[PDB]
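Students often ask what a holo structure prediction actually looks like on paper. The answer is less mysterious than it sounds. You provide the chain, you provide the ligand, and the output is a string of discrete structure tokens encoding the 3D arrangement of the protein together with magnesium ion.
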Amino acid sequence: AKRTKKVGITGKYGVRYGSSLRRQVKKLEIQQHARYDCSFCGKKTVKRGAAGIWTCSCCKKTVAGGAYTVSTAAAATVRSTIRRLREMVEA
Amino acid sequence: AKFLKAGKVAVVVRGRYAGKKVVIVKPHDEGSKSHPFGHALVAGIERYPLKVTKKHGAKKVAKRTKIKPFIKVVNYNHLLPTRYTLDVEAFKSVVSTETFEQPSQREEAKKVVKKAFEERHQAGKNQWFFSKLRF
Amino acid sequence: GRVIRNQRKGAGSIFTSHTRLRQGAAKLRTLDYAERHGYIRGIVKQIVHDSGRGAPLAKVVFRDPYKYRLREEIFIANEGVHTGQFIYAGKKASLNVGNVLPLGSVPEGTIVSNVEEKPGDRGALARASGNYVIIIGHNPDENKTRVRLPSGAKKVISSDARGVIGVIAGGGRVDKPLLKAGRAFHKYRLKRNSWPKTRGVAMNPVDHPHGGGNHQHIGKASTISRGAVSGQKAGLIAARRTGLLRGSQKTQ
Amino acid sequence: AHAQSKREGRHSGYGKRKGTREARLPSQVVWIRRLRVLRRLLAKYRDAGKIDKHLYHVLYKES
Amino acid sequence: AREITDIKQFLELTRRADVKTATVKINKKLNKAGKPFRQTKFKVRGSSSLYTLVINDAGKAKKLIQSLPPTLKVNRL
Amino acid sequence: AQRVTFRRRNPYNTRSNKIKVVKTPGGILRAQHVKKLATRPKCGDCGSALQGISTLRPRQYATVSKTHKTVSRAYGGSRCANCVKERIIRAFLIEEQKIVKKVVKEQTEAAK
RNA sequence: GAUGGGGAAGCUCCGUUUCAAAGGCCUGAUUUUAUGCAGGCCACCAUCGAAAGGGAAUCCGGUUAAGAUUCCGGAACCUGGAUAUGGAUUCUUCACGGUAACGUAACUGAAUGUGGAGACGUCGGCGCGAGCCCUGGGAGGAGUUAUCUUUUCUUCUUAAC
RNA sequence: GCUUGUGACGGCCCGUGAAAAUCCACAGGAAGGAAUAGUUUUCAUGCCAGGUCGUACUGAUAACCGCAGCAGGUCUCCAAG
RNA sequence: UCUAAGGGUCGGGUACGAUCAACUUAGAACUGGUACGGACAAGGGGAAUCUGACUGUCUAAUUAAAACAUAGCAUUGCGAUGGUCAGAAAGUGAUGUUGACGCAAU
Ligand SMILES: [Mg+2]
Ligand SMILES: [Mg+2]
Ligand SMILES: [Mg+2]
Ligand SMILES: [Mg+2]
Ligand SMILES: [Mg+2]
Ligand SMILES: [Mg+2]
Ligand SMILES: [Mg+2]
Ligand SMILES: [Mg+2]
Ligand SMILES: [Mg+2]
Ligand SMILES: [Mg+2]
Ligand SMILES: [Mg+2]
Ligand SMILES: [Mg+2]
Ligand SMILES: [Mg+2]
Ligand SMILES: [Mg+2]
Ligand SMILES: [Mg+2]
Ligand SMILES: [Mg+2]
Ligand SMILES: [Mg+2]
Ligand SMILES: [Mg+2]
Ligand SMILES: [Mg+2]
Ligand SMILES: [Mg+2]
Ligand SMILES: [Mg+2]
Ligand SMILES: [Mg+2]
Ligand SMILES: [Mg+2]
Ligand SMILES: [Mg+2]
Ligand SMILES: [Mg+2]
Ligand SMILES: [Mg+2]
Ligand SMILES: [Mg+2]
Ligand SMILES: [Mg+2]
Ligand SMILES: [Mg+2]
Ligand SMILES: [Mg+2]
Ligand SMILES: [Mg+2]
Ligand SMILES: [Mg+2]
Ligand SMILES: [Mg+2]
Ligand SMILES: [Mg+2]
Ligand SMILES: [Mg+2]
Ligand SMILES: [Mg+2]
Ligand SMILES: [Mg+2]
Ligand SMILES: [Mg+2]
Ligand SMILES: [Mg+2]
Ligand SMILES: [Mg+2]
Ligand SMILES: [Mg+2]
Ligand SMILES: [Mg+2]
Ligand SMILES: [Mg+2]
Ligand SMILES: [Mg+2]
Ligand SMILES: [Mg+2]
Ligand SMILES: [Mg+2]
Ligand SMILES: [Mg+2]
Ligand SMILES: [Mg+2]
Ligand SMILES: [Mg+2]
Ligand SMILES: [Mg+2]
Ligand SMILES: [Mg+2]
Ligand SMILES: [Mg+2]
Ligand SMILES: [Mg+2]
Ligand SMILES: [Mg+2]
Ligand SMILES: [Mg+2]
Ligand SMILES: [Zn+2]
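The corresponding structure tokens follow.
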């Protein structure tokens, strides 16, 4: 029974702060509360609390992640960059 | 193969004797009116032979090397089978189903296995089996 | 006239960091034998939140090379590291995220955090949620290693200066609008008494160089010289250009 | 005496009402009351096999 | 602060040397469903506990009271 | 109708000033300042309440028997039993692999 | 906020583990004797700062002109100190039992190391506990009764341990 | 039902919501211990001791502060139909 | 003064019965000097201009506002041998348990 035409979670703030701001928050708020895939056991049970802290329901591992998503772009790019550089120093 | 045959060493992985090494003597590969699980009859070592050095003399050595044993009915699901293996012959008879029930019976079995294991330790046989597993 | 606000800050009274809750002070291992001849393993025992700090912290346990005991250091958690992970610190340690290596021993293009100005000062550069430094140079004689910092400034330091491979966790924390005074409030609540801010221009002249007048105005240039003296320096200090910054920045 | 006439449905008229229908008896109370009955009727209908487990599992999520 | 049931251990208690006093108490209660009966509580005071043995049976009571160490200042009722 | 009073000087409702109300043989109510509840000890490895172990306020454990503070097994009142299972496996396997990693590089040495 | 210190003409200012030779425990060595030395540790470096934070342990009944978790009575509990008697344990020296989660009246354990408790936001509904509220029968006492009311009112309690 | 206590959950955070005293436990195995008799005081029972200071009452339209037995101010717990 | 609907608990070989206790909600008659949220309790509404976005703040004792604050926006200084600030001095101090997704200054 589609409740809100667009504000979704952001409907809590009602009318205040301006649409544009409410929009920006909704984006990253959608990210942070959302429940993510575990790199380790592979159930979708990773969730936040405390920016940067993504810890996993069952299996109980915590990963240091992006402020509102498990992985930053720039972080992951660095991942592949290190990968690359690492390779160079053995082959 | 059926690696849980009657020579295998395996470390008990649960219950009181968790962490202690044992040997199988007789496997009941499936079933008991009681024990409805794959369970082994093992002879193990409860209190290990404490290490002994040059400085150790006379009656202290003979004391440091006393061994306290145990016998256990134990589910297969509770021992890590090992590649290592120890001979069973001296207490084939002594460790049996009949051995359990009646306390009196159990101790005699332990007396044998104790005299067995101690004879065995000195003269260097098996060595690893007398070494404490540290975890 | 009075004593303006920003000169009151210096005595440290109501100001002084709000420090009760913090995990302790993050820093690399002390740069000892183990760390500067070989490497040394560690277990991240817990990644955890330091109050008043955007970036999450990584508690990491190590053996003590000289006494039978466990010794726990406190690291800023690079993105990607995880409870249970092993961490290798040393010259002869290896190029993976979260390990710590002396700047001279990672190739150009590597990415590191918490890097030392001088070797062993236990980490100084790039500690903020999301920041880092990139190695861009090596001069094997006078063994330096040029890096570019978060600011942009390039700067050369010792090849024995240590850094940790990766990026600091919690990046992007600033893309989210505070939305309301309350969140800003709680923000500074666990930092220090710097919020909210009265505009000097709303003060009387006792209080400020910006103070007074019958409309609110600044009444003179708001750019102030480096050589200004306390009670003067408030506006755009030693500014060298001013106004909207048009055109791509990014230092060349 | 009054209480008596009350359980006979008396003085519960539209004009003897002062808190909203909600306050007087919350919606959710009705729902939980009702859903726990359907939910726990299914148990016995399955636990005795009138209902087969597949039908149950549908009726559950349908309830 | 203690309830006892083995009539032996009791008797042993009553010769325990730190035990200089005792006291019997008598209660009319009712039995099972219908009738009433005479309950009897045997209370030994030890240095750190007061043990009380409830002999429900009318009979065992009487026999018990004469069993009693003739050096124990038993407070009747 | 019957209303109670604090039984101690401390008049504020702090954690160390909990109350319970109680009916006494005199047929009246009174208060009875209740000790904070004790929490259960926790496993050093995982984090669970470790079963087998009694739960007392921490000095109380010195007024209790040894059996109340352990369970019969390597790391009794210390680790969560399933966790022992694990340290036991890991230890074995690592120490075995260790032996394999030794003689296989003893191979390396001669043939290289 | 003392202290090796560092400033200051100086009253004093700064520093709190700080650029310092910063201290003490377990017993052994004594059988001239009371405590010198033999080890081995531990380098933690004052102290003040909460009658709302942390924190060993007590209850009910009686009692006074006025005190009561403080007296009286009975019944407990904690901490320190001494200690013996019964158990348990050992000829397989340092308990057995359960496949296991675990069990128990016990069931030696120095240095050292490690773990846990102490020890912790807020709001929401859901579950349960207690005390209160409401109420049936009965067994007592009170009120109303020109008439009506198997009625109105009240007693029926159970502490720590 | 009402106060209140508690549990297993859930919402929130660029806020993730003290400290030390103190108590226990495990890893360790120094060392000490029996058959003509040893070990054991984390089992039970038994013995001694527990100082110093506060403790009345008021806590408010009269016991506090407001020149006062001032219509002001001044922290909190219990709470019937 | 009635009506209807909404629950619990028990045995059933491997459809139903028997009983316990609850105020909610809708409907229908009858009834009165047309009264009935009967006391108590309990928003006036609407169309505009000016102005501050909002919630919040202040002149205790003549000013509560359009003033201050805020999020949002923009600018400035700074890589530690540093920026800003304290001190008579110093083996001194705030920021700093800090490092540009930071601190400081408009
Ligand atoms: Mg042991
Ligand atoms: Mg001035
Ligand atoms: Mg400070
Ligand atoms: Mg302020
Ligand atoms: Mg401002
Ligand atoms: Mg401003
Ligand atoms: Mg003004
Ligand atoms: Mg001026
Ligand atoms: Mg000027
Ligand atoms: Mg002006
Ligand atoms: Mg202006
Ligand atoms: Mg609803
Ligand atoms: Mg309900
Ligand atoms: Mg139901
Ligand atoms: Mg489903
Ligand atoms: Mg009553
Ligand atoms: Mg009092
Ligand atoms: Mg509270
Ligand atoms: Mg236990
Ligand atoms: Mg227990
Ligand atoms: Mg001083
Ligand atoms: Mg003090
Ligand atoms: Mg106190
Ligand atoms: Mg207190
Ligand atoms: Mg009294
Ligand atoms: Mg008196
Ligand atoms: Mg009085
Ligand atoms: Mg007394
Ligand atoms: Mg007494
Ligand atoms: Mg004692
Ligand atoms: Mg026994
Ligand atoms: Mg500890
Ligand atoms: Mg802790
Ligand atoms: Mg607290
Ligand atoms: Mg008590
Ligand atoms: Mg309250
Ligand atoms: Mg939390
Ligand atoms: Mg404990
Ligand atoms: Mg020695
Ligand atoms: Mg004892
Ligand atoms: Mg003294
Ligand atoms: Mg008093
Ligand atoms: Mg009083
Ligand atoms: Mg008065
Ligand atoms: Mg006065
Ligand atoms: Mg007055
Ligand atoms: Mg009906
Ligand atoms: Mg029915
Ligand atoms: Mg406004
Ligand atoms: Mg005014
Ligand atoms: Mg004035
Ligand atoms: Mg106003
Ligand atoms: Mg006014
Ligand atoms: Mg704008
Ligand atoms: Mg100097
Ligand atoms: Zn997982």
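The first strand of chain F starts at residue 22 and ends at 23.
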